[PDB]
Design a protein around this ligand. Structure first.
Ligand SMILES: Nc1ncnc2c1ncn2[C@@H]1O[C@H](COP(=O)(O)OP(=O)(O)OP(=O)(O)O)[C@@H](O)[C@H]1O
Ligand SMILES: [Mg+2]
Lengths: 132, 284, 154, 166, 165, 154, 154
């Protein structure tokens, strides 16, 4: 096993030992187990899945990057939420808002990227809230 | 006359219960603001670690964000509170912004302002300053995401060349009694202070120049967030001590109001009786 | 002693206060100090009583905050309180009414408002149906409908 | 409205350990310097006004090291002169000894001494002046004038070298 | 100065909807617990301390959800006990029913319920206790003591499952 | 009753108030309660009257804010009021003056200030010409020129 | 006039406070509000006075921190204050005392404690000699020796 700390700039969100950490890196999926090679990569706005034998906690990470050292694993995200602490009806308002604005924006409009980003943050929160 | 003083004591006594409590709430929020800063400091130090590692293995290392230019225009971030009742907290920071703009710049064209907090933008807008972006209604003890859009667009303006220096005015926390207004440079960064960190061996995916392209803007971002949390601690210290004084001043006024109430109470009884007795002695 | 002893002889009272008269609220009736033996669900019916007590609760709360507002200011109130103050001030104005006999003093024609309409009007203000009409709209009108009409002229 | 001045005593001062508890702001002598030996009129001249300003400025004294150096010094002088004007019950002081004690504190001779040591510094200073420098004290009892300020400054600084703080 | 205590009534309380408008803080019975059945002396012990804490913390009630969770709960308990002590005119309550109602609110059985529902919850609870759990009420009328707390807790929680907000 | 009845017999009054004396404002003259039958444009000329009323308007506003100031200080005030309070405090100090007869108490030489100079000084403070002098500059001086001179020593 | 004239003859006050009674501190004498004209070095010794003022300083400081502790917690206090709070709580308990006249109700023997022993006990607590005894040791005991003895039983 290896120790994981998922951290936002304000609080530590998940802490513990873990058999494996599934994280969607920007170049493709990565499974960080104990003894992995020292590495730093930005992550996509996706879940991160953490396995502890039979248990699987799923965290809604956004705007984060992964740092593995031989001993431990740190993920430093702008946002990170556990399933039970995700507001489901707010994630649908976040989705509806940014989805209907996306429909009609030109593909290199000033804010296209920001609203695409905000849609994915809400899309991920809805998946992670279902893993509860 | 007791009709007034009954009600004036009532007012001051109710009001004092609220100032007394408000100091206690301000006290709570200063703790939460310093707690969350003790997470933000290591979060930002870790980013700094990875940045100092990538610089330590690039042979030629340079970035636009570490390269000082000729100052064609300047960008000013200004952190103020949304609510008042915080003594001269906003006055002091705004006077410093007013001073340093008078000494430096000879027209509105040379600088441009990002107003964090309502007191700040209200001041600047009233006096026709070049306020290019704003944010109000920041939560007490806030997450980084609430400062992010105004941080990103301010970094965006330096990342091209809309301006060639970004600077931040806020009240620096010291004690709950002391908060000094100060100015700090954000951009360009100084490699003297961004690279002093523990150098480590990492693999970089896709590569080291690519992760450095996300982390350096992500670091400047956190400086702005650190300044906001120091500025929030300073708000809640200033409010603690302003409502502290208002509580003490209320008790002081309650002494002199009690003294007047009881002169009046005593005089009513004294004077009423003399009248009753004067009437009775005109018949006896 | 004169008015104090007079209270014992009365089944209803209408207490006029100068503070209200000075604000321009006529008739200048203290809506908390005025009382009636028959203000009970048994006599005026369940809705009337509920509305009247509702009105008095809002006015009482506003009264308590007058001191706090004068020093600490209106921005520092909770959202619940700022809404109560808004309604209290509308309620306070809707209790004013031009009198037939006062056509010389008000300069406006007088109004007779039946109980059913009085209850309906104050019920709606408490319910929030007129939170966006300006305060002057409720001042010196009869029915709630005349307040909606007066808002258009502003 | 009848008398030639008043000495107001205030409870807050009294119970905080300022005894005698003279409210300096309200109190006054309409006779003033006419009822004083020239030595005392010289050393005390602005004393009342200096302490009245101290007591007002004491409200804003929470900023130690942050507060500007002018007001810092005024507060440090003030706390020390307050300690001098504390005085135990049934322990009257001769005028000549008062003038020396007030001279010492008002010309800065206790500025490097801890505030808690000021009262012992005074007691030790005067027993020194009585035993060793009585010619200076005697000048005041006879002439009513201050002695030579250079001789007096020297004599206090002489005492200072045998004083152990805490 | 003659009597053995006093019940002070206030206009501000009355017009704010606290009826009967008893200022509980300032009013006094010099006889006290001696004039109370053991059940009532027990449950009222906690009501007094709950309201004393409420009255101190009342300044902090416009700061809803800024406050730490300890003081939040004290305010929530306080507003509920206030609702229990409101009481309709010409509607006296037997002491056995009072003891149950005060027991309910002071041991937290109304903390899950909206403040606006508390008074109806009480009326519905007591009609339930009278119809179905009269053996518990009768214990109090005969002994003057509380019934066995485990039986009583169960009977209230039984009622709760049939209550709709 | 004694002083109250005495007012009817007077063409001018100088009302001394202890609050001012305790602040160190001597002479301790209430600048709103003091009155004169001849403070009119007909007697003192048009400029004098305008200035005096200007001074009293500023002091009256400051007087109204004294409850808010006593608890909150100056920090909560609008920009219009902060400017008024600034000037009011300078005005209040410039009304103080060392007396020839008080050379024994104050230790300072007294000052005679002619009317022309008094009017000129207060006119300038109202006009804003001395908004940058510190407050202590105006305290216990004489002419406005002595206040400008005292500012240099601070 | 009634209390004012009575007060001229009082040498001492004993202020009983319900807050202390509710904590279980009996007798419920407010150790800050109660006063005596003869708590002076002249009458009780020099040591007595020093100790009593020491006790009151510690209690007063603890009182001031009650609000700060409740919100910011104990980590916020300086090392000097944490030590003062520790002693204050022991002091507050050592001021409690079982009464002979409560021997029937408490079922515990009452205690007479002479002045010499009272002074000695509180002197030692202030000096730090019993900083390692648990707090309950000082509650409802007589001499300091009985507190040391009660510690063994816990
Ligand atoms: N659905 C949610 N449930 C719970 N917390 C959330 C949710 N969305 C965001 N947060 C939290 O609120 C803050 C805002 O984050 P962020 O700005 O990334 O979200 P957002 O998509 O802009 O939110 P929204 O659009 O719903 O306002 C963060 O501290 C975050 O963890
Ligand atoms: Mg957001």
């Amino acid at each position: 096993t290896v120790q994981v700390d998922i951290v936002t700039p304000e609080r530590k969100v998940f802490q513990g030992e873990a058999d494996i950490v599934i994280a969607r890196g920007v170049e493709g999926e990565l499974g960080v187990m104990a003894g992995h090679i020292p590495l730093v990569t930005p992550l996509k706005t996706a879940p991160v899945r953490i396995k502890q034998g039979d248990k699987e906690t799923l965290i809604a990470v956004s705007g984060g990057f992964l740092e593995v050292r031989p001993d431990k694993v740190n993920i430093l995200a702008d946002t990170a939420e556990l399933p039970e602490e995700i507001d489901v009806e707010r994630a649908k308002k976040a989705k509806a808002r940014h989805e209907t604005i996306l429909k009609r924006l030109d593909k290199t409009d000033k804010d296209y990227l920001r609203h695409k980003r905000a849609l994915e943050r809400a899309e991920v929160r809805l998946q992670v809230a279902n893993s509860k | 006359g007791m009709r007034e003083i009954k009600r004036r004591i009532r007012s001051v006594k109710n009001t004092r219960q609220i100032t007394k409590a408000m100091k206690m709430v301000a006290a709570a929020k200063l703790r939460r603001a310093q707690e969350t800063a003790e997470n933000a400091r290591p979060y930002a130090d870790k980013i700094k670690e990875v940045i100092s590692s990538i610089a330590a293995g690039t042979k030629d290392f340079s970035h636009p964000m570490l390269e000082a230019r000729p100052v064609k225009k300047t960008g000013y971030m200004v952190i103020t509170s949304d609510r008042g009742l915080a003594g001269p907290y906003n006055a002091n920071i705004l006077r410093l912004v007013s001073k340093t703009i008078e000494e430096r710049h000879q027209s509105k064209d040379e600088y441009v302002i990002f107003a964090v907090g309502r007191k700040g933008r209200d001041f600047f807008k009233k006096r026709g300053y070049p306020v290019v972006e704003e944010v109000t209604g920041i939560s007490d003890t806030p997450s980084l995401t609430e400062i992010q859009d105004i941080a990103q667009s301010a970094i965006g303006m330096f990342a091209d060349e809309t301006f060639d220096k970004l600077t931040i005015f806020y009240n620096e926390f010291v004690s709950p009694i002391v908060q000094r207004p100060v100015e700090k440079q954000l951009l360009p960064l100084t490699s003297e202070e961004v690279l002093d960190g523990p150098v480590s061996a990492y693999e970089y995916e896709p590569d080291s120049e690519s992760v450095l392209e996300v982390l350096l803007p992500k670091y400047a971002e956190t400086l702005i967030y650190s300044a906001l949390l120091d500025a929030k601690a300073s708000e809640f210290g200033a409010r603690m001590t302003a409502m502290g004084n208002a509580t003490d001043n209320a008790t002081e006024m309650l002494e002199t109001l009690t003294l007047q109430f009881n002169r009046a109470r005593q005089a009513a009884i004294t004077q009423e009786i003399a009248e009753i007795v004067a009437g009775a002695n005109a018949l006896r | 002693p004169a008015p104090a002893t007079t209270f014992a002889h009365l089944d209803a009272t209408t207490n006029l206060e100068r503070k209200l008269a000075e604000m321009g609220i006529y008739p200048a009736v203290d809506p908390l100090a005025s009382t009636s033996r028959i203000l009970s669900p048994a006599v005026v019916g369940e809705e009337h009583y509920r509305v009247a007590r509702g009105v008095q609760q809002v006015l009482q709360r506003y009264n308590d905050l007058q001191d706090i507002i004068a020093i600490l200011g209106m921005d520092e109130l909770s959202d619940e309180d700022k809404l109560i103050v808004a309604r209290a001030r509308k309620i306070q104005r809707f209790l004013s009414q031009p009198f037939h006999v006062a056509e010389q003093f008000t300069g406006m024609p007088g109004k007779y408002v039946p109980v059913k309409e009085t209850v309906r009007g104050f019920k709606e203000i408490l319910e929030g149906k007129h939170d966006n009409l300006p305060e002057e709209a409720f001042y010196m009108v009869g029915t709630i409908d005349e307040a909606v009409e007066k808002a258009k002229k502003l | 409205s009848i008398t030639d001045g008043q000495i107001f005593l205030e409870s807050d001062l009294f119970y905080s350990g300022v005894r005698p508890a003279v409210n300096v702001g309200i109190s006054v002598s309409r006779v003033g310097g006419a009822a004083q030996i020239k030595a005392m009129k010289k050393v005390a001249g602005t004393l009342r006004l200096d302490l009245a300003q101290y007591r007002e400025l004491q409200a804003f004294a929470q900023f130690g090291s942050d507060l500007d150096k002018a007001t810092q010094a005024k507060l440090n002088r003030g706390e020390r002169t307050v300690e001098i004007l504390k005085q135990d019950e049934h322990k009257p002081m001769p005028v000549e000894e008062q003038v020396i004690s007030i001279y010492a504190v008002t010309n800065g001779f206790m500025d490097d001494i801890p505030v808690e040591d000021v009262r012992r510094f005074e007691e030790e200073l005067l027993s020194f002046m009585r035993a060793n420098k009585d010619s200076l004290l005697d000048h005041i009892r006879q002439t009513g004038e201050l002695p030579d300020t250079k001789e007096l400054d020297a004599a206090i600084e002489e005492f200072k070298k045998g004083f152990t703080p805490s």
